[PDB]
Every structure is written in C-alpha cells, then in structure tokens.
Amino acid sequence: IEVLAVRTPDSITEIEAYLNPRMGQPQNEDFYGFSDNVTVSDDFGSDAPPWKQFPCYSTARISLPMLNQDMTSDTILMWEAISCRTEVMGVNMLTNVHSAQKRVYENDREGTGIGVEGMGYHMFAIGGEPLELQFMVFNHRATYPAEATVIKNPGASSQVFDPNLKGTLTADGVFPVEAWGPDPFKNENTRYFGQYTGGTQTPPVLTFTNTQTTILLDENGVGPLCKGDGLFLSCADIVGFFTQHNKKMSFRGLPRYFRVTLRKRVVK
Amino acid sequence: IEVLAVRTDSITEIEAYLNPRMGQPQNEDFYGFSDNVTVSDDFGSDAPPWKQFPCYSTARISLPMTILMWEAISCRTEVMGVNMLTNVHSAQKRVYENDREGTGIGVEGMGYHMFAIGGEPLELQFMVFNHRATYPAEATVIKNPGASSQVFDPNLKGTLTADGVFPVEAWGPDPFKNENTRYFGQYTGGTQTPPVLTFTNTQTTILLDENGVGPLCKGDGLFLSCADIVGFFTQHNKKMSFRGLPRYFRVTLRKRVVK
Amino acid sequence: IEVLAVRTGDSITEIEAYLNPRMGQPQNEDFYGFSDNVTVSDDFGSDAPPWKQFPCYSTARISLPMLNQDMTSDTILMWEAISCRTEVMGVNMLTNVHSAQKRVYENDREGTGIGVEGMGYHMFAIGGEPLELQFMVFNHRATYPAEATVIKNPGASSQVFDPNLKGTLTADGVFPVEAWGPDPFKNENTRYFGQYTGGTQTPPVLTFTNTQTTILLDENGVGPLCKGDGLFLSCADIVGFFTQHNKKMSFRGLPRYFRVTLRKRVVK
Amino acid sequence: IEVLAVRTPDSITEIEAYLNPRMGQPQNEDFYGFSDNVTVSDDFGSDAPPWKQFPCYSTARISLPTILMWEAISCRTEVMGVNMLTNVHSAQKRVYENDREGTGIGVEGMGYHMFAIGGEPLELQFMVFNHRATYPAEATVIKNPGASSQVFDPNLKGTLTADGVFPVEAWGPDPFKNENTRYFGQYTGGTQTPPVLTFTNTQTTILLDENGVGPLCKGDGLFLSCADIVGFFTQHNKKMSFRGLPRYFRVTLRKRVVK
Amino acid sequence: IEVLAVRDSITEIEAYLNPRMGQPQNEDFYGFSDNVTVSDDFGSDAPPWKQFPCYSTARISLPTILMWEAISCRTEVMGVNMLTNVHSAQKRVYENDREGTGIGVEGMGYHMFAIGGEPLELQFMVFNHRATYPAEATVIKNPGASSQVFDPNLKGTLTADGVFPVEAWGPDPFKNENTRYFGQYTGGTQTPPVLTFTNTQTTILLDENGVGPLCKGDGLFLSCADIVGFFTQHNKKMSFRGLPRYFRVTLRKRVVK
Ligand SMILES: CC(=O)N[C@H]1[C@@H](O[C@H]2[C@@H](O)[C@@H](CO)O[C@@H](O[C@H]3[C@@H](O)[C@@H](CO)O[C@H](O[C@@H]4[C@H](O)[C@@H](O)[C@H](O[C@H]5[C@H](O)[C@@H](O)[C@H](O)O[C@@H]5CO)O[C@@H]4CO)[C@@H]3O)[C@@H]2NC(C)=O)O[C@H](CO)[C@H](O)[C@@H]1O
Ligand SMILES: CC(=O)N[C@H]1[C@@H](O[C@H]2[C@@H](O)[C@@H](CO)O[C@@H](O[C@H]3[C@@H](O)[C@@H](CO)O[C@H](O[C@@H]4[C@H](O)[C@@H](O)[C@H](O)O[C@@H]4CO)[C@@H]3O)[C@@H]2NC(C)=O)O[C@H](CO)[C@H](O)[C@@H]1O
Ligand SMILES: CC(=O)N[C@H]1[C@@H](O[C@H]2[C@@H](O)[C@@H](CO)O[C@@H](O[C@H]3[C@@H](O)[C@@H](CO)O[C@H](O[C@@H]4[C@H](O)[C@@H](O)[C@H](O)O[C@@H]4CO)[C@@H]3O)[C@@H]2NC(C)=O)O[C@H](CO)[C@H](O)[C@@H]1O
Ligand SMILES: CC(=O)N[C@H]1[C@@H](O[C@H]2[C@@H](O)[C@@H](CO)O[C@@H](O[C@H]3[C@@H](O)[C@@H](CO)O[C@H](O[C@@H]4[C@H](O)[C@@H](O)[C@H](O)O[C@@H]4CO)[C@@H]3O)[C@@H]2NC(C)=O)O[C@H](CO)[C@H](O)[C@@H]1O
Ligand SMILES: CC(=O)N[C@H]1[C@@H](O[C@H]2[C@@H](O)[C@@H](CO)O[C@@H](O[C@H]3[C@@H](O)[C@@H](CO)O[C@H](O[C@@H]4[C@H](O)[C@@H](O)[C@H](O)O[C@@H]4CO)[C@@H]3O)[C@@H]2NC(C)=O)O[C@H](CO)[C@H](O)[C@@H]1O
Ligand SMILES: CC(=O)N[C@H]1[C@H]([C@H](O)[C@H](O)CO)O[C@@](O)(C(=O)O)C[C@@H]1O
Ligand SMILES: CC(=O)N[C@H]1[C@H]([C@H](O)[C@H](O)CO)O[C@@](O)(C(=O)O)C[C@@H]1O
Ligand SMILES: [Mg+2]
Ligand SMILES: [Mg+2]
Ligand SMILES: [Mg+2]
Ligand SMILES: [Mg+2]
Ligand SMILES: [Mg+2]
C-alpha cells in the first residue's frame, strides 16, 4: 500500500467493542468466564490437556462506517487506526472472597477465601488485518483436543522458535494461549502489547481508568490501515486461578473494552 | 452539551470526605470494618450476608447557583488515616501465634482503591464472580443476572445513585459510558499481600479530556464516588474482616458557557 | 497573608536539621531507636497499648536568621521555604544480621539473624507553622497511656473520618503515629509526604542520595511562609520490626536529615 | 576508526534475526528449550556441573549487504513464546502435591535476560560463584581461573565467539571494553520468584552513543548475543531444569563514511 | 573553594573496586564473608572479623589554578552473570527430598557508590551500640546509646579499604559537599536479588550550580558496597556474597580561585 495524505470534521470516527474471555467453559452456562478444573499429566509423552481446561485467544472483526469514496479519483480512502483506550472490565469482581473458595485458614475452617491468585497474562492487539501468530509450546508432545486449532505433531523445534510454524488468529475461542503468540517477524499492520506475571499464588495487579490513550501510529506516523474496511481486535486476559475447598483450580478471565479512533487516509 | 468559552469570581474549590462502607454500621464499635467473612461451599449455595462485603461510597456536592455550568478542571485526592495501619496491638492474630508472641500481623491482603469525579452519577457495569450469588435485601444488584453476568453483558447496566448499598464485588465503572466522569482504579489481590499506600497534599490530577473540557456539573451537582479496601483484619481466632479508609477530595471548578 | 515579590540577591539561606526517631524506648538508654516489646490485646474493649510499645511523631521548630526588616515599609519580610533535601540516615545499620536476632533456621540454631522486616511508615512535613492533624484510630476503644497526646474516648466515628477530631503537632515524642495523620483539609502552609508498606515479614526498601531536591512551591509558586520566623519539621520513619530469639518484636526507627533552602518574600 | 559523515533509500538497511536459547538439552530432541535436571554439589572443592545442566550464551554473526561501513542506529528486540508460560498441565509439580490437586506450579524462579548488539563479538569478563568448579569439556571457560575469578581480575578476559558453549554462570559483559557494542541485562533471583515478561512490536531502542555514533559493523558483520533464562520447570518428583525462550531482533543500519 | 570558568582539557578514568565481604582475598572464599554467627543479647554481641562486610574505597591519581572536575560517570555491578549458578554447594529447594536446584543467592541487597574530590564523609550509626567490633575493624569504640540513632559527635571519613564495617558507617548528609553518593537497601534473608547492567547509562555529577566534584590534590575518590545477598550451605550456614563495581569517570579542567 502506497500511503498518501491524511484527511482533516467528518474525517474521524470512533468504535467501541468488547471481547469476552475464552478461558474454556461454555458460554451461557454456570462457569462462563472460567476454565474447567485443570488436570496435570505425569509426563510430556502422555500429556493431553482436555478441551475446556485451557484458555484460548479472543478475536473479533469490527465492520467500519461508510468512507464515502471519491468515485472518479484513482486513490481510495482507508480507515487508519490512530489511537485507542483499552480497559480490563470487571476488576471490581475480584473483591469477592466468599464464593466457594479455599479459605486462608482451611485447617481452622476459618478466614476469607484466598480469592483469585496466580498468573496474569494480558495482551491486546489492534490491526487492519488478522493478528499474525508464531506457534510455540512448552511441550511439543502435548496432544491438543479436536476443538482447538494447533499445528499437529509440531516437533521438538516448536519448544523454541521455528520459522516454519506460523498461524493467523482467524477464529475466536479455539487458538490456545499456551500454543500461539504474536509473530514479531510480521504484524506490520497490527500493534500488539503483552504482559506476563507467572506463579500460582501471585497477587493479581490490575488498573482501570477512562483517562489513558495509546497512540497507534508507527515511526512513519501511520496507524493500522483497515483492509476491506475491517478493524481486527485480539486479546487474552487471564487474571489468575480460582481454587475450590477440594483444591481444584481453574483459570479466571475478564472481558476487555476497546475504544479505537480512526481517521480517513488516502492510499494508492 | 455544546461547549463554548471558559468564563474568566470565575473559579471555585470544594473539599469533601467519603467515609468507607465496608459493611458494619456507622456510629458502632466496628465502623470502618466488615463483619467477619463467611465462605460458601459451592456457587449454588452462595448468599454473602449483609455487613460481610464492602459497597461503594458516593455523594452529590451542591455547587454555587447560552448558560454557565460549573466545570471540574483539577482535583487532589488522599486516602486519610494511613497512620492507623501502624497499630499491631488491637486484638490481632500474632506473628508467632503458637508462642503467643510477636506483634499483631496487622492489616494484610487485597487493596482496592478507586475514585471517580463527574458532573453526573458514576455509570456502572454489573459483573460478578458467581452469577448465582444471592445478595441481601439491603444491597442494590441486578437479580438473577444470568451466566453472562460473569463476563460482559451489555444489558447489565446501573448508575451509582446511593451510598453504602452497591456491592463493590458486583459493580464497576462502565467504560462504554462516563463521558462526563473521570475514574481511576487499582486492585492488588491476595490475603497476606503487604498493603502499599502513599499520601501527600502536593499532587494535582488534571480532569480535562483531550478537548480541554472538564466534567460539566449537570444541575450544579458534583458527583464523588470511591471504594478504599485496605485489606483484612485477622482476629486471634482467624476470623477475617475487610478494613477500609475514608477519602479526601479537593475539586477546582471554573464557569464555562454552554448551549 | 497577602503575598508580594521575591528577593533574589542576603536574600537566600539554608538550614540543616536532624529529627531522631521516637519509637518508644527512652533516649540515651540501651534500646534508644526501638520500641519496647509489643503486647497484643485479646479484644478491642480491653485494648491498652502500654507506654514505650508504640511510636510517636518527631517534630522540631527551627529558629531562622534575622530578616533585616525595612523599618519604614508598610510590608514585612518572611522566610519562604522553596526546596529541601531529606534523607533517612543510618540505612547502613540494617546490614546487621548478628545482633540478638531470631535466626533464619531457628530449628537448626543456624543461619543469619532475619534482620529488620515488616511495615515501613515514612512521612515528613516542612511548614511555616505546626503540622495540622486528623485523629484516626484502628480501634476507638483503645486506652492510650497518660504519657501520650490523644483525644480521650473519641468514639466509633474516630475509626474513620470525623471532622470534630483535630489536633496540631505541638510536641515531639508524644503524638502516637497510630492515632494521628496529616489533615488534608488544612496544611495550606505545610507540604507533607507519606509512604506506608505493611506486613511483618516485608523486606524494608530504602534509598539514600545527596543528589535529590524536592521543590516546596505550590501551584502559585509560593512556598511555606515561616510565621514567627520558625521552620516546622515533622517525621516518622518506622523501618520495621526487630525479632529476638524468644520471638519478642519491637519497632525499629531511623533518624531523618533535612536541608531546607529559604528565600526572603515580601508580604502585607 | 575515524568516523566521518552519515550517507542519506539505498543508505538504510533493516535485518531481522532470532536466537534460540541454549539451556543445555540438545537441539531437535524432546527437551529442546530446557536444561537437564540440575544436580547440586556437596562443596566448592568437588563441584562439577555436568554438560546440559547449565545455560550458555546464544550468539550469531549476521552478514550485511574513505570506506563505507554499516552503522546500527536502532533495534527492536522481543522475547518470543511468552504465551507458552500459561501452560500448567505439562508434567508439573502441582500446587497441592499432597492432595494430587491444583494446576502445575508452572515456570518460576530466577529470570536472567540480556542482549547485546555490536560491530564485533561481545567482549566478556570471566567471573564465577566458585573458582574451584570443574566445567565440562563442551564448555568454553578459563581453566584453573584462581580465587580472584570469584570477583574482578583484569587478566580473565574473553569474547563471545561460539553459540551454546560460554556458560552464563562464568562470563558476563566486560564494561572496560565493548566501545562498539550496546548491552542490556536484568537479573531477578530466587527459585519461587514469578517470571515477569513483556512483549510489544511498538518499542525501539536507539543504539547511537554520546557522539551520535552507533555500532560500526567490522567485516560487514552484525553481532547479536543474548541469554533468556525464564525460570525453572519442576517435575512431580521435584527435579528442576532451566527453561529458556528465543529472542527476536530487528536492527536498522545506515551507511557511514569512516577513515 | 571559589569556582571560575571551565578551561587537552577532558580526561576519562576507569576503575574497579573488589568487594570486602570479610573472607581474605586470593583464598577460596574471596567475595564471601565467613559463616555468620548471631549473639544471644546486645550486651555480649561481638561479631568476629570476616563475618561482616566493609566498604571498598580507592584514590585514583589523575594527570587562579586548575583542578580536575568530575562531570559524569558510568558504574556497573560486574559479574551479575554468576548468580545463575544454582549447583555450587547450595541448600536445595526440596532439601527433605535431596532434590531441586540450589536456592542460590537470596536476601538483603545493599548497593551504594560515591564519587568525590575528597574521602567520603561518614556518620557513625549502629543497630546495637554495645556491639564490640574486632581489632581489624575501624569503628568508634564504646560509642554510647545515642549511636543507635543520630549523634553529631560521631563522624569519620572513609580513609581505608576493607576495614570500615558497612553496618557501622553510612554517608553523612551534613557534609559530602564535594562528593555525590547513591545507595539502595532491600532487606530480608529470602528476598530475590534484582540487578541490572548496561554500558548505555551515564549519571551527571554536576550540582545545582553546574559544578561537579573538584579533585583536591588531583585525587578522585571512589567508594562502594555491593551486598547482593546470602549464600546458604546444605547445613544452613549463611555468608554475605558481594560483587565488584566498575567506574568510568569523565573529568574536565576547571579554573578555581
Ligand atoms: C518432563 C517429563 O516428561 N519428565 C519425565 C521424565 O523425567 C526424565 C527427564 O526429565 C530426563 C531429561 O533428561 O531427565 C531424567 O532425569 C535423569 C537425568 O537427569 C540424568 C542425567 O541425564 O540424571 C538422572 O538419572 C540418573 C542416571 O543418569 C540415569 O541413567 C538413571 O536412570 C536409571 C533409571 O532411573 C532406572 O529406572 C532404570 O532402570 O535404569 C536407569 C539406569 O540406566 O537414574 C540416575 C538417577 O538415579 C536423572 O534422574 C528424568 N527422569 C526422572 C526419573 O525424573 O521421566 C520420569 C520417569 O522416569 C517422569 O515421568 C517425568 O515426568
Ligand atoms: C465453584 C463450585 O460451585 N464448585 C463446586 C462443584 O465443583 C465442580 C465444578 O467446579 C465443575 C466445573 O466443571 O468441575 C467439577 O470437577 C470435575 C470436572 O472438572 C470434570 C471435567 O468436566 O473432571 C472431573 O470430574 C470427573 C468426571 O468428569 C466426573 O463426571 C466424575 O464424577 O468424576 C471425575 C473425577 O474423578 C472433575 O472432578 C467440580 N467437582 C468437584 C468434585 O470439585 O461441585 C462440587 C461437588 O461435586 C463442589 O460443591 C464445588 O464447590
Ligand atoms: C475485634 C474484637 O474485639 N473482636 C472480639 C469479638 O469478636 C466478635 C466480633 O469480631 C464480631 C463483629 O460483628 O463478630 C463476632 O463473630 C460473629 C459474627 O460475625 C456473627 C454474625 O454477625 O457471626 C458469627 O456468630 C454466629 C452468630 O451470628 C452469633 O449470634 C452466634 O453467637 O455465634 C455464631 C458462631 O458462628 C461470628 O462468630 C466475633 N466473635 C467471635 C467469637 O470471634 O469477640 C470475641 C470473643 O467472643 C473476641 O474477643 C474477639 O477478639
Ligand atoms: C562452600 C563450601 O564448600 N562449604 C563446605 C565447607 O564449609 C565450611 C566453609 O563454609 C568455611 C569458610 O570459612 O567455614 C566453615 O564454617 C566454620 C567457620 O565459619 C568457622 C570460622 O572461620 O567457624 C565455625 O567453625 C568453628 C571453628 O572455627 C572450627 O575450627 C571448629 O572446627 O568448629 C567450630 C564451630 O562448631 C564454622 O563451623 C564451613 N564448615 C561447615 C561445617 O559448614 O565444609 C563443610 C564441611 O566441613 C561442607 O562441606 C560445606 O559444604
Ligand atoms: C535485644 C536484647 O538484648 N534482648 C535480650 C533481653 O531482652 C529484653 C529486652 O528486649 C527488654 C527491652 O525493654 O525487654 C524485655 O522484655 C520485657 C519487657 O518488654 C517488659 C516491659 O518493659 O515486659 C515483659 O517483661 C514483663 C515485666 O516487665 C518483667 O519485669 C518480668 O520479668 O516479665 C514480664 C513478662 O513476663 C518483657 O519480657 C526483654 N526480655 C525478654 C526475656 O525478652 O534480655 C533477654 C533475657 O531476659 C534476652 O537476652 C534477649 O535476647
Ligand atoms: C493434561 C493431561 O494430560 N491430563 C490428563 C489427566 C491427568 O493425566 C490425570 O488426571 C493425572 O492423574 O488424566 C485424565 O485421565 C483425566 O484426569 O481426565 C485425562 C487427561 O488427558
Ligand atoms: C495492648 C494491650 O492491651 N496490652 C496488654 C497486655 C496484653 O493484652 C497481654 O500481654 C496479652 O496476653 O496485657 C497486659 O497485662 C500487659 O502485658 O502489660 C496489659 C497490656 O495493656
Ligand atoms: Mg518484518
Ligand atoms: Mg461511549
Ligand atoms: Mg483547605
Ligand atoms: Mg574502555
Ligand atoms: Mg552541609
């Protein structure tokens, strides 16, 4: 794409969208927002995580307003994503230490719940085309379930970087977070942002405000250009683990808010 | 609201406090605390009793009476009474309980610190850890909110219109609304987490949006909201209660012409 | 006070001062810098913290040089504080893990002392008049000893904010840290800065440098104005707890350094 | 090298490269990305860390397109595969081992993240926890380094000239050299520390020095070096191995006239 | 000490300070203290020589009058790489199972450096005033109860390497007009060490007036302590582990009265 002039009163639009988490349990059922209880393999050889027990990436394509093209010009207008605000919603719910939680003083049947604790994985991506993925796994001999999208028998090389093992995030709730990450060799037309804090007893730390704005412009002053007039949102928002009295543990996820400002860009 | 020129007599300043609503009744010996937290066995038999969970604090501040509206341009906010957390002697589980020795363990665990300042009530998203929780009659909640309530459901909206009754654990700020409010929030989780608090009279936050417009005080009302969970108070017998702290606000407003 | 012009030539001065901590144990006896061993009540109603077992605020008024007043002027000169350096001194001493401390591996009588750990409370205030206080307590039914300055029988409202419960920090070593904090409704003529990190096994975190200057000027470019030609300094520097082999714990505090640059200001 | 004027497309090139980690286990086999299970010696005197049980630096030379030299002016770098650390099912010691319940504990313990970009091999200082350690034949070390190798000895020098054979625990960047290399490094210690990693394609680091000069690529060669220890993998039987991640590099060079 | 204009003219020195954690140099525990013993009370407290760290220090010789003025510095904790060692005679993560890595180096961090035109000026201050320091150590003997906090009588200067106990001396903020000092402390005995290294960080040494330290007698004074944490043996004996510090200083010629 040959990028040309920015248009400056009717040249800018705003979209707002949410992505619900895909932590593994089905929508419209009692554990929506959570994974199912996590089972652990005895070895890498026999490792087979069941469907529902691991999170997947969230994705959506947002259809943009009419650009009102110039019928006789040899150029076209494209929506250019210039800025965003993103917030993890429902942080407030993590003040719940009463709902069926392993207690601080289990031996005394006393104390609050321990609440949600452990690993936070927070990433979002805003592009003019689907997020480009690198396949990479902890254990290449893991047998993923039929419901999941992965590279089957990916080989030892998939435990680190293999340039043959590529993907694109083309479907919501089926690309396992533990098997796909953003590809830094691609995503020329996406901005991605990721933070990981590991562990299983780590205090979760989350902020929320409606006062924060991230500029989406690259080093040439060009934001994502929305090919076929779509805006591609991707995320994963693991808050940590929910622990039952019987010590079963499940992933807990939260939904993400996006506001994206776009402006009209002349191209070609 | 169409926003015209800043009027430049033109400036006012209010100070206010919101006391915390951790659950125990005001004017009684456990004011500032929740009652002792009980935990359900399962999501299906989950009814957190009244007094055992915190609620948002809120207040409408009356301001002096094309039109002029009061426009909020800056604030200072301070969590008050941080000093009281140096108390490790008041009926606290001890560091070496099995020796009946050491300090009290003092206040530890989750911090949830949020404030909002706007020209109308805080717009809220309903969201809960367990949709099947039965909240007490005293609480304001969406009843039988459905499985969708565990994540984002665009039907499940509310506005913060009463002090001490909107459970923190069931409402948060709606990012899809609040064009006329600035909100700020931090959560640190856990039950033995060290609390981290700062205080100073030297910090101003600017409340102007990208367009240089502050919150515009509809009907000459300034809306303040907070929640300041500091962590938990643990008794000798291991019973745990939320402890909260009051919040100071100073807001600077200017006359702005509109319509 | 009506505030007029700055003098910029004679017109500048610096004072340096220390405040020693008032953690509870008497001065120039063997436990100076410490509290006595902390006792814990069984309930709120029978809560009576003995004198010496809890810290108090440090404060001093510093006498300033003669201003050399213009005898015939309608106006008057005051000293205006414009900047400070402050440092917690003796941080070096906390590398001591041999001095009668509970050992890391007590069941094996082995390892270092555990050293000082637990809550940090670090605050300082620089003003032209005494620090204005808000009375607030964890437990209102606490009976403070006669040695201590408190509001007696303050009632339930004292557990949160009650606008009736005020004070000024008019004496060193007697205002319990746990019952008084800075009053954000007053202190127009004082700058105060406070940090708390809780717990009883929290690692203390402290920094020291002679390269850090804090400006004391308000939004109007006016510093604290020294009424009756006094500078008021206040602090509390709880570093954490000292734990003995028998598991007795005391507060440990450190002294604070102040450097304050003042300049002549004309006022009505 | 006398450094004259910047030549201003055809004057700018951009390379991209990955460095796979060298945690110890062989390439293209089932434990690629890990060390073998760590053994611990009884004393300094008889301390022989076996080949495969310790990490080594990753390094590559990239071949690039009055003389003209390539001058590295900026980079992006990213630790890849951070996403795999959300795996708590793969043969991991469980949170509640006694009850055979909970997630795996996942990767925890020490983080060591370092990268270097230079016009020549990274210049190294030899320094070791225990000088009496006997390294295996596969490792490049200074043999019989002496007690002074446990701190700084100006005699104990090297350059990173070989991928996967310079042990991290024996070699670090030499601050007395590396005039023509930029290095960055962070260590967080412990064995139960939570790993903290970030990733984004939006961060650029400028490689120009105080004089506006970046690494100048000798022999038309760009030198990349790293080590990315994420933490430890703990089996059900409490055996612990290093886990590493590959690092991405993007480097932007310009033609520089030199003498 | 009146300063005129900045006046061939710019020079740069590099130095290293090895750590003085207690164990004698060029012997097998160089970089470590000896195993720490703990007193039963303040009254009998007598830390043995080799069981506590001392400050490192050196004077570097440099090449109306002219003085060398220190304008900027680079400093680096060297050898952070060695802390990836979890095999060398360390208490194991799962000692009851004789399994896991070593726990490695853990506990308190104390990192301080000073760059000045004269010896670093010290304030004497001790946890316990009744501690008896050994003959080898430079201390104020019988310093009294006020030495547990600030006493203005209890001053010193860092005149010697490896003999001023870290736990007895810190920088005096009432003096050091011609030194820049920087310190960080993180306590605990199981705290994770956090260390960074780059050749890309330069600290400016100019004061508010734009004057850096002026090197009296053409001597540059370098001081540091870098306690990274503790080494714990299988038998639970614990010793300080320290690391050496790199210093790059840029000096320019300043005219003085
Ligand atoms: C992630 C996964 O699937 N892990 C499962 C696996 O663990 C093995 C792997 O982690 C390998 C990776 O190299 O490491 C094994 O541990 C060995 C290995 O580290 C070795 C050095 O390379 O040192 C020890 O083994 C010693 C010796 O070298 C071995 O040859 C010897 O092996 C004997 C067997 O133990 C006997 O059962 C057999 O009859 O005869 C051989 C002798 O020829 O054992 C020596 C120590 O006694 C390390 O232990 C990992 N193995 C183990 C036991 O953890 O496989 C195990 C089941 O073995 C689990 O399924 C694990 O989940
Ligand atoms: C939060 C709450 O109310 N929890 C209570 C609930 O726990 C059950 C739920 O958490 C569900 C969520 O899917 O999982 C149950 O555990 C199951 C499943 O994870 C299942 C896979 O879907 O795998 C295990 O069950 C298998 C098998 O599928 C079962 O049909 C079979 O009977 O048992 C197998 C295991 O041996 C796994 O156990 C949770 N059940 C238990 C137990 O925790 O319900 C329980 C009472 O049953 C408690 O009240 C919880 O508080
Ligand atoms: C800080 C302090 O001084 N605490 C001492 C006090 O503890 C009691 C308080 O913490 C109050 C605060 O409301 O709670 C008591 O626990 C009760 C309540 O939480 C109650 C519901 O409001 O629920 C429990 O009581 C139920 C039932 O509701 C009661 O009517 C019944 O008599 O007992 C039931 C037992 O399940 C809960 O226990 C605190 N009481 C105890 C006990 O902790 O008084 C105690 C000694 O009695 C100690 O002195 C505390 O230090
Ligand atoms: C790192 C290593 O290889 N450690 C192995 C070693 O441990 C010994 C070393 O740590 C040295 C370093 O100086 O200290 C020994 O501990 C001794 C000393 O600290 C000593 C004072 O210098 O104080 C203690 O010993 C005293 C006395 O001085 C001794 O002469 C007397 O025999 O015993 C006294 C106390 O009862 C202190 O114990 C370390 N020794 C031990 C033991 O830990 O050697 C041991 C086995 O000898 C292990 O192999 C270590 O892994
Ligand atoms: C740091 C050090 O050297 N500690 C050793 C020392 O411990 C004693 C000191 O900590 C002093 C400091 O004031 O306190 C003793 O504890 C006492 C006091 O806190 C006291 C009130 O001032 O309260 C307790 O004692 C009361 C009563 O006052 C006593 O008269 C009576 O004998 O016992 C009462 C309680 O039953 C409290 O115990 C420290 N004493 C002890 C013991 O910890 O001295 C001891 C030997 O006694 C050890 O050598 C310490 O390491
Ligand atoms: C990640 C993984 O492989 N999980 C597997 C688990 C665990 O191996 C065991 O629960 C440990 O005993 O075993 C199953 O039979 C189960 O519980 O459903 C099947 C599942 O494929
Ligand atoms: C804070 C507090 O109330 N402390 C009180 C302590 C503790 O309650 C007990 O030591 C617990 O057993 O008891 C006293 O008898 C004491 O030891 O002097 C009275 C003192 O006022
Ligand atoms: Mg590319
Ligand atoms: Mg909106
Ligand atoms: Mg006021
Ligand atoms: Mg050099
Ligand atoms: Mg001075």
Structural features, described:
Five copies of one chain form a homopentamer. The first copy, chain A, is mainly beta and 268 residues long. In chain A, the strands form four sheets. In chain A, strands 1, 2, 4, 13 and 16 form a five-stranded antiparallel sheet that branches. In chain A, 0% of the residues lie in helices and 38% in strands. At the A-D interface, strand 10, strand 11 and strand 14 of A face strand 5, strand 6 and strand 12 of D. Strand 12 of chain C pairs antiparallel with strand 11 of chain E, so a sheet runs across the interface. Residues 185-186, 188 of chain C line the site of one magnesium ion. The PDB classes it as viral protein.
Order of helices and strands of chain A: EEEEEEEEEEEEEEEE
Helical fraction of chain A equals under 10%
Largest sheet of chain A: 5 strands, antiparallel
Which chain pair has the greatest contact? A-D, 62 and 58 residues
Q: CATH first level of chain A: which class?
A: Mainly Beta
Q: N- to C-terminal separation of chain A?
A: 6 Å
Shape estimate of chain A? globular
CATH topology of chain A: Polyomavirus Vp1, Chain A
Total domains of chain A: 1
- Quaternary arrangement of the chains shown? homopentamer
Q: Return the structural class of chain A.
A: mainly beta
Tally of strands of chain A? 16
Rg of chain A, Cα atoms, Å: 21 Å
Architecture per CATH nomenclature, i.e. the level-2 architecture of chain A: Sandwich
Tally of helical runs of chain A? 0
Say which molecules are bound, naming each kind only once. a molecule of 5 linked components (BGC-GAL-GLA-NGA-A2G), a molecule of 4 linked components (GAL-GLA-NGA-A2G), N-acetyl-alpha-neuraminic acid, magnesium ion
DSSP strand content of chain A: 35-45%
Q: Write the CATH homologous superfamily of chain A.
A: Capsid protein VP1,Polyomavirus
PDB class: viral protein
Keywords: polyomavirus, capsid protein, VP1, glycan complex, viral protein
Assembly: pentameric
Entry title: Sheep Polyomavirus VP1 in complex with 5 mM Forssman antigen pentaose and 20 mM 3'-sialyllactosamine
